[PDB]
Structures are given as structure tokens and as C-alpha cells.
Scaffold this active site. Structure first.
Site, PDB file in Angstrom:
ATOM      1  N   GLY A  45     -35.419   7.916 -10.685  1.00  0.00           N
ATOM      2  CA  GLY A  45     -34.029   7.782 -11.064  1.00  0.00           C
ATOM      3  C   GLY A  45     -33.875   7.986 -12.549  1.00  0.00           C
ATOM      4  O   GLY A  45     -34.833   7.899 -13.315  1.00  0.00           O
TER       5      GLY A  45
ATOM      6  N   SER B 249     -38.589   2.968  -9.941  1.00  0.00           N
ATOM      7  CA  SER B 249     -38.397   2.325 -11.268  1.00  0.00           C
ATOM      8  C   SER B 249     -36.910   2.071 -11.518  1.00  0.00           C
ATOM      9  O   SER B 249     -36.493   0.955 -11.272  1.00  0.00           O
ATOM     10  CB  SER B 249     -38.971   3.126 -12.375  1.00  0.00           C
ATOM     11  N   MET B 250     -36.101   3.063 -11.885  1.00  0.00           N
ATOM     12  CA  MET B 250     -34.692   2.788 -12.225  1.00  0.00           C
ATOM     13  C   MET B 250     -34.015   2.262 -10.981  1.00  0.00           C
ATOM     14  O   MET B 250     -33.357   1.256 -11.060  1.00  0.00           O
ATOM     15  CB  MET B 250     -33.956   4.026 -12.725  1.00  0.00           C
TER      16      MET B 250
ATOM     17  N   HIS C 206     -40.726   0.040 -15.172  1.00  0.00           N
ATOM     18  CA  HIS C 206     -41.091   0.979 -16.210  1.00  0.00           C
ATOM     19  C   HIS C 206     -39.795   1.592 -16.685  1.00  0.00           C
ATOM     20  O   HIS C 206     -38.856   1.723 -15.901  1.00  0.00           O
ATOM     21  CB  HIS C 206     -42.038   2.042 -15.665  1.00  0.00           C
TER      22      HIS C 206
ATOM     23  N   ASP D 263     -47.672   0.985 -17.082  1.00  0.00           N
ATOM     24  CA  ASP D 263     -47.542   1.494 -15.723  1.00  0.00           C
ATOM     25  C   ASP D 263     -48.616   0.879 -14.850  1.00  0.00           C
ATOM     26  O   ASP D 263     -49.806   1.135 -15.053  1.00  0.00           O
ATOM     27  CB  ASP D 263     -47.651   3.018 -15.694  1.00  0.00           C
TER      28      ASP D 263
END
Lengths: 168, 6, 168, 168, 168, 168, 168, 168, 168, 168, 168, 168, 168, 6, 6, 6, 6
Positions: G52, G81-82, G106, G150
Site C-alpha cells: 500500500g 504494511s500500510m 514498516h 523489517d
């Protein structure tokens, strides 16, 4: 609700494109289809084609000779080789043509399977020279010199062979 | 193409 | 409302293209489908195919032998290798062919998975030489020399093996 | 429910694109179609085309001369080299054109089959020079020098030949 | 009104293609769907697949273990590696296979995310070697030498492990 | 049930794209269509176009001058050359424009046929300079120096020519 | 009548693909849609996503916080992530996950506009580190060292942060 | 029956993509459409766009100022530039934005026609600097230094200009 | 320093590819070249070709008959149609062939210009049937039935015509 | 050390391909080049070409008439239009042709610039009809009916015009 | 050892293609090059070009005016808008042209950078109208109406302006 | 033996294309190269470029400041942004330009690495605004409003900043 | 005679592109090459690279540590992951950098083989964290938190680690 | 595939 | 196109 | 987005 | 470009 579909209704088929196995299956089905509705109604078959191959052409001819109804044929425009062998395979008195139409007779292109099957190609293209000889009325030894060369014959002169017997 | 095919 | 769909009605299937896993799943489903409507109505299967692979061909054969109805087979035109092994796997007295149709028997192309699975390919293509020997009524050691070469036998001569038992 | 479809209703056809065998079959069908509903209603045919080939153009002309109804013609915009001819092949008193429309007469491009058929092309393009001479009223030996050159003729000056006989 | 859609009716799903996130979402939905109609009707799942990846395969397995109904499994034809692992994850007494079907067990290809996630891949493929050990009945130290090599196992010999427990 | 289709209802057409023979035929049809429902209802035509060619532009202008109803015109946004010429060809008192719209007059691009027809192009683009001179009210010898150069004119200043006569 | 459409019924949305502006608009609409039918029915949102971008992710979060109903969240499989920042932006006691699901945190990839906007990117990714700190219960100075590295975290260990609070 | 279509119902439009002439025509139509149903119902317009060109943006602005109903505007996410000039062109008290949304003001890219029209581009982009000055309340000589540079402005700070007047 | 280049030295040319205008110019040049070094040294020409066109083939034949030296010919492998006419156009006693080589005679494909030039093609392919009749020794009325059909003739049987007169 | 390069030596040029501006520049240079070595040595120019355009053809003709040496011309094979106008522009007694070569005269294709320049094309192609009339010896009013039609003329009949004056 | 390279020797350059930055750099270099060998030898520049852009054309003109030698110019064939401005920028008495050459004057296409730089384009194309006015001898207010329209001018009539002063 | 190669001799480099890492390495090498032959000979650098990126531009600037010889700079035609920063980085009294050349100053496009490195881009483009301030003589707070906007500056007006100090 | 080739002379290599197996082999060869000429001459290695992979980077490092001469290193511009690990692997007192150069340390992308080799990747990237710890002088437990995150470090601050020890 | 799966 | 075609 | 746009 | 750069 397409226009060709409506022509399938009241018993017409339009071979117009070319012949290969993709269209062969779709024509064999329609022939068997229309036979089921009525067993005596005259079905027809319009032809305008630039060619065809050997293995599929001898599938429609067999199906044509099996269904109890009788088929009629017309030549719209071009009558390539092979696909036009079907035109000479309808009924003894219901083969027509328009008076600007061209028809030629020539042994087709390509192979049987579509390695190379030599002994079988050479047998298949002997049948054509023998079936055409019983539907026109000629000797065999003349067809064997017109199924080796290339020249388009008009509609008024095709009559003297027997491919057509009434020109509208 | 009638008269007569149909 | 397509034409093939109407042929699915009143119990016909048209394997016409080729065989791979994409079409295999779609044929296994139709077979199981039509069994559910009636458990005794004779289903049929028309064949016109240029080839096929090994792993999927031995999925339709198993399904064919499981559903309680009985299957019939016809050869329209070409009968490649493998896809035509199905033709010799219908009923004992309902295998037909048209009198211009070609059929050949040859071990198929390609691999099993579709690295290379050696021990399994070599076993699979032994089954074919053994199942074909119980449906034609012949001694093995002849099938083992006709499942290694290539020569299309006709419809009139295929009868003497047992692949077909009545020609219409 | 398309707009052209509604124009097929109440008896209009729109040749607008070009001519080849793909569109020829689809126009021959519509002509035969509309004849079946009523045998005396005047059908029409609108033309706006950049060209055309020889073999298919002499399929629509024959069909046009066979159905018992009478056809009318109009020139919207361009009138290519082969389309034009159909325009000069309608009725003796129902050929129109708009007063900015261009029409030219020229022998078409390409071949007959669409090897090269020499003896047949050269015969086909003699018919055009002879049919055009009975529908305009000119001598033959003038058409033979206007079916070899290239120059667009306007709508007001086309009248003096006979391609058109009333300009709206 | 498609044929697969009708198979979704009366509780069948056809994983036939491959596994990735695109098809995973569409299968998780159908599973949750059919659960809502009835909470006790036996749903089934047919398998014929050439592979699969790691992250999505451990989404269908979880969903399978959550819905209150019970799932059954069958092997049509090929049984790849990650897919096959689903076959060994149905019920304790409703795992089937056809008697020509091949199944193999091998750790899948590719990564988790589909940089490289090392510590997580190596953990995920330890779970497989542990879940497979509670559904077959073997020790762990034998699965750890059959989830590292490649050889297809037939349907009659797969039974001695526990992947399948009744062959139709 | 599209939005443009609903705008065809209650008598609007949206030339928005460009002009060539493909869209010309589809606009001539709609004009003739709407005339058939009622012979006095004011039809309209909205314009927003980046160009156009010569042969097709002089097909819509003729049709516009033939149907008994009267057409109105509006300039949304751009008014390229050639298309704009239609804007100056509506009614004497029903030509509008929005007060940020640009219109230019320039002889179009391309040829007539769309070899090169020299004597005919040069005649066609003389008509434009003569028809535009009877709809604005200017002399001819000024239009002949504004149909050779390029500069966009705003909506408030276009009024002093006569292309537009009321700005909303 | 698609399957996802039926899942839109009874209040579910399936973000499954990725995030960009094309899908963002189509999700904001569904959220506003379902709010209009009933203002208290619990809507849900299933997540399985590989990534994303920054600008669109902070459009769904705002819309989620505005509609009077309350949203619930689940993690099927991956939690990129997003997109997975959305999972931690549910309703204090209705965040779930399956017990094989992976989630990572992240800062996303790419830019804001999707020249380079430096001062704005650097501000946007400070908000994330501050909103995540009020929904988990941690200090800020630990999130600032877990939003720079990560490593995937499992579902059983994610609980100790606060991203999830009940594992089914 | 699409979701956007249902949003067209109850008076919303979603400019979400970009601006060019293809989408401009389709938005002008919807605006004129919804005006016809009711002449006082408040229509709205949601914006999320990465850019736009000059000639089409000054078509929607004019149409917006002509229909008797009043338009409202919201900024979802990004507010590119020419499109976002529309956001500052709604009503005096019905301009909103979400509290993470970015908006910038900058003169657009590209040309007018979309040779180069120099005298006209330079005039068009003077209007923008003058219309924006009557809708915010600033002097002109400050807008002339904010319509030449590039920097995104947040939603809380955009208020001090006048582009937005209530943040939800 | 290529190998063909060294074969150009000591007087050999290798027509091996096909014939069109690109290779024709490059062969006419070499022929004129080698004549300049010595006016009595026997040049040769090796042939192995799958076809050729009409207009270029009658450029090499003329050049061959003009240079004072004498040319010799050999058939390596295939002897197409057009080319195979050059082989019969060397000297009266220096035409050779290898004893597995195939040669056929057939009128070529394609047109003259490479619209259709009917009157000129039909004249050109009459010359071929007349030049071949003076170099073999046959009547004309037999060549006119062997320049219309297709069948490859071996090297031992080609001798009885006169195309070749010594087989090495 | 190419073969054409060696033909540039001892004063030959090979226009063989086509004419456009790319080859025009490269031929004008060679002509000016060879003039510098010797001012009286007869240069030659061989032609075999399928066409040419108008603007470049009237660059080689001018250069040919300026250099003090005298040019000779030969027709190898085809003599398209335009370029073959060069063949009739050499010397009064040094124009040749081979006795199978075809030459036609027809006004070329395409435009001048290569918008449309009408007044200039129509002037350029008047010069051709006037220069050709002073190099053959015919009236003008016959060339004006042979520079509008299309028919290839042989080498023996071309002599009666004056394009050629000695056939080798 | 190319032919153009030999023309670089003894002081000629061939701008023949078009103008952009790729060829501009390669011409500026040759000009500076040849100046270094001798500071008084007359260099020349041959032109045959279909166009050119604005920014690069005003790089060659400056370099031409700086090197101490004097440049001469000739028009081979076409002379396009920008480049041909170079033809009018050589010496006061060494500008030539062939007596079939076309030259036009028109302001070029495209932009300066090759966003849009409005204030700079409009200034650059004012310089052209001012430099051309000091090299021909005309007033300014006539050039301002010949640098806005399009019409090719012949070589005999170009002389009356001053672009050329001796025609060979 | 190319022309640029000869310009490398006697100490010139031609940055003409663009800047990226491919050309950067090839220019750094030539600079270090020519330094090795002589340590006091003035090297030069000609510029004509449409852009450049940030990371590579600050490699040539460092190398330029390290080699003991002194560099000179000239602006041929366009002077992009980043590159045009090299022009202002030569010697205090050897920066030139031609009197039609355009130069602009603007912060470049793209990123540093060529995820997004925010903190580093924003630092790099602060150095540019500080180095340019010590080579022109201006304050810093004016450069910070000319390194944010876009407008080309001519050669006569660039002098008042200090980018150039003598115009030839 | 290329410029890089001359830099290979007097002992320089230019790794400038990227690292993969194609360039690795070509660099290992040059290193072994130059060792053969002299066994004590200091070879150097210039770096400017955007990345690199794991398996090939640990081939150049080994070769660097084997040849008896000593290597020196410089950072031109960018210093990515992996390759820039080479920069910290030269000599204890001959590592340099320019004072605008960026260097980062991060574990590389991709896999080892270039299925997935998990146990081996995870071992390889432990060596990097251990070799870097003996060449800088830091503890291990700090490198393990700088070989997991991403942030570019400048040349003046890189010194405090030990990657560089003298900045020119 | 019934009897007995379904 | 009526009156009179149709 | 109501209350109050709609 | 000399006199005087070179």
C-alpha cells in the site's frame, strides 16, 4: 438475437469463411440439429469460401449423405477448391448458382492431420477424383487432368460438366 | 432465393 | 442460449479441441452432472481431436467407468492418439465411426506433470498397452508393436482390431 | 437495441465502411431478409464508401436484380470507384445524391480471388464497362476512356452522364 | 448460468488451476458462504492442481478447520505439493482418490511474501512437517526425509501412509 | 441505459470527439432519426472538438439544411477549425457560446479522399470561404485572410464577426 | 450476481489486492454506502494485502473514524504494511486474526503524490508513528525502532503489542 | 447496477481519475442531467485527482456557475492543482476537507489545444490568478507568487487562505 | 575475407536464397564485373532456390545472353520454378545436375510490378513457354500443359526433355 | 571494399531501390563527386526502380543538367514512374534499354512536402508534362492523356515515342 | 572512408535530415573544426530539410556569425520553416538556389525546451521576424503577415524578397 | 577516428545529452585523463542539456574542484537546471555564453538513489542553494525564492546575477 | 582503443554499473591479470554502484585478499549495499571518499543462487556482520542494528565508524 | 461421486 | 430523406 | 459525509 | 570559440 441466427431458423446455413476443424464441428451440429425438428423439410446450404482442407471436408459430406432430409446448394460468389466439392454433392436437381459466380476444381492444400502422412493423403485425393465422376457424368480420365491444374470457370460454362444444373 | 430454392 | 449448450441437453458432449487440464475439469463436471438427472439414460460422447496428454486422459477414463449409466462413442473425422484411446473405452457394442474417419494409435507426447518423472511415465504408458488389449480381444505382443509406430488405419480396416464394431 | 438496427427496420441499409467478403455476406442476408416481410415495399440503400473489390461487388448487384421489390440509392458524401457502380444499378428513376457529394468511376484494385487469375480479371472488368453503358445511355467507346483514368466528378456534373437523375 | 456455478450449488468447489492470492480470496469466500445456508451439510472439495505457494495455502487450511460443517476431499488426477497438503487435511474418514491418480509431497516453491524473509520461511515449512505427522500416523523423522525429495506416488501405495483411506 | 442515450432523448446530440467517416455516419443517422418523431421540435447540437476533415464535414452541413426542423448550436470549450464551421451554420438567431470558450477559423488538414486530388481540394475549400461569408455578414476579401492564418479568438470578440449572436 | 457482491450484502468488504487511488475511491464509497442503510449495524473489513501507499491509506482511516457505526477487522493471511496499519485502527475490542497469520509494521514505499515532496513525506510518516502509539499502549520511542526495520511477526506474538486483542 | 451509478443517484459525482476531454464531456452531462430532475436540490462533487489540463477545467467551472442549484465540494485525499481550482469554486460556505488531505495551487501543465498557442495560454492562466482572488479574499499580488511555486499545504493551514472554510 | 567472396574469385556465383529486386541488382553487377577481367573465361552459376518472381528473372537472363563469355549451370538440390528457368538458359552443352536433385517447371507467383497489370503479366508468361521450347527441343503444345500443373521431376527423368544434358 | 563501391569507380551509379530524400542526398553527392575527377568523362546511370516522389526527383534532374560532363541512361528491368522520367532526361543519343524491360509514364504519388500544398503540387506536375514534350518530340496534348492513365509499355514500342532511341 | 566524410573535406556540410539537439551538436563541432585549419577559406552549407525546432536553430546561427571565415548557402530541393531561416543568414552575396527549389517562411512548431514556457517562446519568435527584416530589405509589418501563414514560394519569385540573390 | 574524439584532443568535452550514471562515469574519466598529460593546460567544457539528476551532478562538481588545472564553461543553447549548475561552477572569470542562450535555475527532478530517501534529498538540495550563493554574490534569501519557481532567463539578464560574466 | 581500456592500463578498474555474475567474472579476470605484470604495484578500485547481490560479492572479496599486491578503494558518488562492503575491505590505510559521497550499509536483496536456499542465505549474511566488525573496530551488537535498517550516511560522519579513514 | 462422496 | 426517398 | 454535506 | 575560450 443475431441475423445469422434467424437464418438458422427456416433452414439455412452460411458457410462463408473458410474450413478448418473449428467451423466443421459447428456445422455438423447444426445439420444434426435441424434434422431433429422435422425429417422431411428441405434444408439448404449457401457457399462463399476461399478454400478448405482435406480432413474436415470429408466430414460434412458424410453427414450430408446420412440425414434423411435432402440438402440444396447455391454458389454465392467465389467457389474456391474443396469447399466447392460440397456444392457438387447436394441433390441431383437442386444445385444452383448466380450468373456471375466463379467455381474452380483443384486438389486442396495442406496435409491430412493438419510426421507427414504420405500414403494417406495420396489415397484421400483419389476419392475426390472418383466421387466427382459419379455426380457430373464425365469419364474419370478427364477429371484427372482437371484436378491437377488451375483455372476459374464461369457459371455458364460450369453447366456443361454437371457441377450445376439450373442457373437462376 | 425463392421461387424456388426455397 | 448457445448451440453446444442445447447439445448438452439430450445428453451429448463434444470433445472437439484438444486435451489439457483446462478442458478435462470441464468435461468431468458435465459427466457427473448428467448422471444426476437420470441414472439409466444413455449418454454419448463425440470425438474429433488432434491429440492429448497422458495425465488428463486417465481422468476421463476413470470417471467414465464409475457413473452407473453407459457411454457411447463416435469418431467424427480425426482420431489422434490418446483422445482416441477413449473411443476404445466406451461400451462393448456401442462404438461407431463414419466411413471416412481416420484413427491411429500411438503413445502420446509430453510428460506426466505437464524435473522429468521417468519412472512414472514409463509405468503409465504400460497401462495403455494393457487396457487396450482387453477391449479389442487381441494378444498383447502385437499392441506393443502398434503402440510404437505411426500409420493411420482407415475406418473399414480398424474394425479387424476391435476399436470399432459397427460402422454407420 | 442499436441505432443501425432501428434503421434496418423501415427498410434501410447502411453500407458505410468498405467492401470485402465479411460485409458482403452480411448485406446479402439483410436484402433477402427484408424481401420476406413484404414483396412490394421499396427498400433503399445508402452509400458512403472509400473503395471495394471486384468479386464481392458482383454479388450484391445480382441479388439486387433478383428480389421482386425495387431498390433505391443515395450518395452520402464519397462515392469510391466500386461503390459508385452499385449506385448506378438501382432503379431507372430513383437514384439521388446530395449537392456536395463526389463520385468517381475507375476500375477497382486488387484481384479476383482476393496464383494471379489473369484471364478472369480481364473478363470481369469488361462487364463493368458494358453494364454501365446500358444504365447511363452513353456509347461504349467513351466509358472505355473514363474507366481508365482518375478524377472526381461533382454531383451537378455527374447528372449529364446518367449515374444520377434527380438531385435533392 | 455457468456449469461451475451449478456445482457451487449442492456444495462442491473446484480448485483446478493453481494457488495464489487471487484464487485464495475467492475460495475462502465460497467456504464461508455455504456455511451460512446450513451448518451441518457436508461440503466437498475437488482437487486437481500443479502447484501452489506457501502463504495462501495456510489460509484455506485454517478456514477449513473453523466452519462447523465437515469437509471431504477427492484427488482428480494430479496432486501437486502444497495443494496435496489440503487433501490430507479434510476429515479422518472421508479422503478419497481415483485409481489412476498421482500424489506427491514436497515442500513448495517460492517465498512467503510472494527482501527475502529467511527466518519465517524456515519456520513455516516446519509446521507442514508437523501437521502432516498427526494426520497420517507416521513418525516425524520419516516425513523429514519425504518432504525433501521428489517422486510421485501412486494411489494404491499412498494408502500405506494415511494421506488417503478409501479408494473408489 | 447510458447517459448519452438519455441525452439523445429530448433532442440533443454530442459531437465531442473528432470527425471522420466513422462518426459522420452515426450522426447523420441520429439527425434523420429525430426528425421522424416530430417535424417541428427544435433539435440541438453541442460541440467540443479538436479538429475534423473536409469530406465528412460537408455531409452534416447538408443534412442539417434539409430536415424541416431547425437546429441550434452551442460551443462548449474548444471550437477547432472545420467543426466550428458547423457552429456558424445553425440558425440565424440560435447560436450560443459560453463565456470562456475559444473558437478559431482555419482551413482544415488532410485531403478529400482521406493519388492526391488537387483540383478538388482547392475547389472544396473555396466553398467554405463563400458559405461563411453569407452567415456572418462580412465581405469575402476579409475571410480570405482569416481562413489562412491561425489565432484563437475569444467568445466576447467572436461576436463582432457573426459566428455567434448571443452569449449566455 | 457475483459472490463478492453478496458479501457486500450483510456488511463485509474485501480489501484483498493492494492499495492505490483506483481501489481507494471504490472502498470509500462502499463505506459511505452501507452507513446509509442502518446507522448502528456493525460493518466489518477483511484484510489480505501485500502493500500500500501513503496518501490513500490516510483516506480510509479518516472515513473509518467518521461514520457513526463501528468497524471490525480481521487478518486473513498476510498483513503487508500500510494496509495493516488499518488493522490496528478498528474498535478497541474487535480486532482479530487467524492463528497462522503474519503481520509486519514498516513505513511504506513510494511518495506522497504517487517533483519529490520532501517536507511532506517526512511529516506524514511521523503521524503513523504517533497514531500507532495510542492504539497499542506502548511508548513512542519503541515504535520509532520498529517502524524502521523489517521482520514479520506471528499472530501469537503480535498480541503483546496491541495490534490484536483476541485470536480465534 | 454499479456502485458509482447508485452514487449518481442521490446527487453525487466522483471525479477521481484525472481531467481530459474524455471525462469532461461525461461530467458536464451528469451536471446538466441532475439539474433536470429538481431545480433546488443540493448537488455535490467529490474530488481526488492528481492533475488536469487547462482547456477542460474551464468548462466544468462555467457549467457549475450556470445551473440554478448550488454545488458543494469536498477534498478526499489529494487535491492536484487545476482540479483543485474547482474545489475553490463551489459555494461560499459549503467547502470541506478531511483532516489529512493535501491541496496545492500551481498553474497547470500542457497547452490549450491539448502549433503552440502562446498568446492564449498566457491569457488563460491570468484568469485563474484573478478568479482565485475573489473567492479567498486575498490580494492579487500574493496569489501571483503562490501560482508560480510548488509546495503542498495541509488542511489545517489551507483554511487561512479561504480555499476551505469548515473542516470535518 | 568471406568464403563466398573467395568463390566470387575463380568465377562462381551462388544464387541460393530466393529472387527479388534486392538480390537481382547484386547479381547483375557481379556478372558484368567478372566479364571485365577476362572476356573468354568460363563463368559458372550454381542454383539452389525455392522460388522467384517474374520481373527480375527476366533481367538476369538478358544479361546472361549479352556478355561475350559463356555461362555454365548446375542444380544443387532444389530447383524452384522461376530460377529453374535460368538453369535451362545457359549453354547448349554445359548444363549439369547432381543425381538426387529435383527440378520443376511452373509459371511463377505474384505480379509484374511486385493496380494489377493484367495485359502485361499474360504476355510475359507467354515468352517463358516460347523460350523454353527452343532450348529443350520439344513442341510448344506440350510445354503449355507442363507450365500449368505441379509435379517435381527427378534428375534422371529431366534429361528426356532437355533441361539437362549431362548428369555427374 | 564493396562491389557497388567498385562500380562507383569507373563511373557508374546504381539507383535500384526507390526514391526519397535519404537516397537523393547520397546520389547528388556522387554526381558532384565524379565531376571533380575529370570534367569530360562520360558518367552513366543505371535504373531499376518501383516508384519515386515528386520533390526529390526534381533535384537529380537539375544536378544532371548542370555538371559539364554528359550522362547516359539504361533501363534494367522495371521503370516505375517519376524516376523513369530521369531515363528520358539523359542525352539525346545515349538512352538505352534491354529488350525485355518495361517502362510506364504516370504522374507520381504523394505530396510535395512528403497541410497539403495544393497550388504547388498542381504546378509541379505541369512541368513534367512540358519537359517530357521537348525530349520525345510529341505534341503536348497527347502527353496530357498518357500522364493520366496506367499501362506498361514494352521496350520495342517505347521507341516510337522517344523515351529510348537505341535498344541493345 | 564514407562519401559524406569526403565532402567534409574541401569544406562542405550537408544538413539533410531535420534539426534537433542530436544533430545540432554535431554541426556546431564541424563548423568550429574547419575554422581551425584555415581562417579565410570559404566554407559552404547545403540545405535540404523538412523542418526544425526553435532552440537549436538559434545555435547554428550564432556560431555562423562568430567564426572569422564566411559561409555560403544553397537550397537543394525543399526549404522548410526554421532551417531555411539559416539560408537567409549566410552572406550578403553568396546565397543561391536551384531553379526548381521551394522555400517557405513560417514560424516553427513545438516549444523552446523541446511546463510550457510561454513568455520565452513569444519572445524568441519575435527575433526571427526582426532578423529576417535586416537581411532581405523589407519593412517589418509585411514580414509579420508572412510569418503567420503557409504557402510555398518558388525560386524565381523568392528573389523579389531577398532570401536569394543569384539563381544558378 | 570520430569527430568528438578529435575534440577530446585539444581539451574539450561535450556534455550534450542528459545526465545519469552512465554518462557521469564516462566524463569523470576524461577529466582525470586530460589532467595526466599536462597539469596546467586549460581544459574546457561545453554544455547543452535538457536536465539532470541530483546524485551524479555532485560527482562532476567535486572532480572539477580537485584537478589542478582550471576549467572553463560555455552555454550553447539550452541550460537545463542541475547541469546549469555546473556552468556556475567553473572559474571566476571564464564563464561565457552565446547571445541567444537560455538558462534557468530550478531544483532538479527525481530522487537520490535514482525506499524514498527523504532526509537526504532535503539535505542535498540545501547545498545547491548555498554553493550557488558563493559563486554569484547574492544573498541566500533570494536564491531560496529562485530555486523554487520556473522561468527561463536570457543571456543578457543572467549577467546581473553572476552565473555568467562575459558574453561573446 | 577505448578510454576504460586505457584506465585498465596504469592499474585502475571501474566498477560502475551493478553486480551480477556477468560482470563478476570480468572483474576477477582483470584482477588476476594485473597481478601477473608486477607483484608489488598498487592496484586501485573505483566504486559507484546502486546495488549488488550476495553470491558474487563474496567472490571479489576473496580474490582481493589473495593476490600479493594491495588494493586501494575510493567512493565516487553513491555507495550502495553489498558493493560498498567492498569499500570497507581494501587496505587499513588506503580507503578514501569524496566529500559529497553517500554510503549506506544494509543487507542485500535477492537470494543466493540468483528452490529458495534458506539455511544458506541466513548463514551468508551472518559473515557480513562479522567481517565488517573486524575492519571498522566496533562491537558486533551495534552492527547487528545497522545491518537491518536503511539510512544514508554522509562522508564526514562515515569516518567515525571506520569504513573510511581519510577524506580527500 | 455418489454413492458415497456425495 | 423524405419527401421522397422515403 | 452527513451530518452535513449531505 | 577562440579568441579567447580557447
Amino acid at each position: 438475437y443475431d441475423i445469422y441466427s434467424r437464418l438458422l431458423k427456416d433452414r439455412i446455413i452460411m458457410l462463408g469463411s473458410a474450413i478448418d476443424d473449428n467451423v466443421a464441428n459447428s456445422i455438423v451440429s447444426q445439420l444434426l440439429f435441424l434434422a431433429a425438428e422435422d425429417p422431411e423439410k428441405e434444408i439448404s446450404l449457401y457457399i462463399n469460401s476461399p478454400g478448405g482442407s482435406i480432413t474436415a471436408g470429408m466430414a460434412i459430406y458424410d453427414t450430408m449423405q446420412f440425414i434423411k432430409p435432402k440438402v440444396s446448394t447455391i454458389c454465392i460468389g467465389m467457389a474456391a477448391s474443396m469447399g466447392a466439392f460440397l456444392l457438387a454433392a447436394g441433390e441431383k436437381g437442386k444445385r444452383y448458382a448466380l450468373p456471375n459466380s466463379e467455381v474452380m476444381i483443384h486438389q486442396p492444400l495442406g496435409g491430412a492431420q493438419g510426421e507427414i502422412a504420405a500414403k494417406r493423403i495420396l489415397l484421400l485425393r483419389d476419392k475426390l477424383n472418383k466421387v466427382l465422376a459419379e455426380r457430373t457424368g464425365q469419364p474419370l480420365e478427364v477429371i484427372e487432368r482437371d484436378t491437377d491444374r488451375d483455372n476459374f470457370k464461369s457459371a455458364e460454362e460450369a453447366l456443361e460438366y454437371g457441377l450445376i444444373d439450373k442457373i437462376l | 432465393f425463392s421461387p424456388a430454392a426455397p
